[PDB]
UniProtKB/Swiss-Prot annotation:
This is Proteinase K. Ca(2+) 1 binds at P175, V177, D200. It catalyses: Hydrolysis of keratin, and of other proteins with subtilisin-like specificity. Hydrolyzes peptide amides. It comes from Parengyodontium album. The gene is PROK. Binds 2 calcium ions per subunit. GO terms for cellular component: extracellular region. GO terms for molecular function: metal ion binding; serine-type endopeptidase activity. Belongs to the peptidase S8 family.
Amino acid sequence: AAQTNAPWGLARISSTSPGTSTYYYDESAGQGSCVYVIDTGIEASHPEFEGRAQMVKTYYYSSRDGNGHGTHCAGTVGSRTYGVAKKTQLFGVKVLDDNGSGQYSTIIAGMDFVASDKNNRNCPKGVVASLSLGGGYSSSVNSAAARLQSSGVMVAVAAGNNNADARNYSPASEPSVCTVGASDRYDRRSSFSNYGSVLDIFGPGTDILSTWIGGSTRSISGTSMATPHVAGLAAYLMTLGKTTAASACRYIADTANKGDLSNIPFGTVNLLAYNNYQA
Ligand SMILES: O=[Se](=O)([O-])[O-]
Ligand SMILES: [Ca+2]
């Protein structure tokens, strides 16, 4: 399948070159998979989600996304126009308040929620969790992410936006999850992206168009935007039967575009997420 005039990041993840504008992907499109977006919520009524998004948990007075961040991330996972996996099921877990903040204890509860809640859902092709969030190093946050992964969920987490080594941030620094850095449309490391040995992969993160609250769209930047590209890619590849939740990060690294990013510090992987879709 071909989506013309796609956002650059979608085109990038189906290309061996920068500078194209068509996203190519297998029609299965993540059908039968599930992606949990653990964030500020999801505006499930947005037409872009086509009834495939729902809120499943909140720790606050509403499950509404009063911020936009979670809606944007969910759109990159699975919206019809802006998403990688255009037929996946999206589940929102609101661990972040409408200012975009959340206590680590709430974030931990939300991860253990997903590990159990997947047993309440129909996800025959597998389960992914996208965590476009983080703070300073915490062994308990890392352990929660490790449990979620161990439970059979492909966990993708943002590396962080400090232009620093991700070893000092959580859940970025948890080794067993998929830690995602950000690149731009010219195949440069995004200016803000964290780096370091713990990164597994890069995805598009600078100037990413996606859904926003109030039925709208906007372009924003962050490792928060790179993460859902990888989460959606995992869901897509799991639906194709190419990999599994336990193995998807490694598979994505195996199959990535290699050596094509600039300003990658010595000791950080030079790997850009790629679907290897051949029609
Ligand atoms: O190239 Se794009 O996706 O319009 O910023
Ligand atoms: Ca890892």
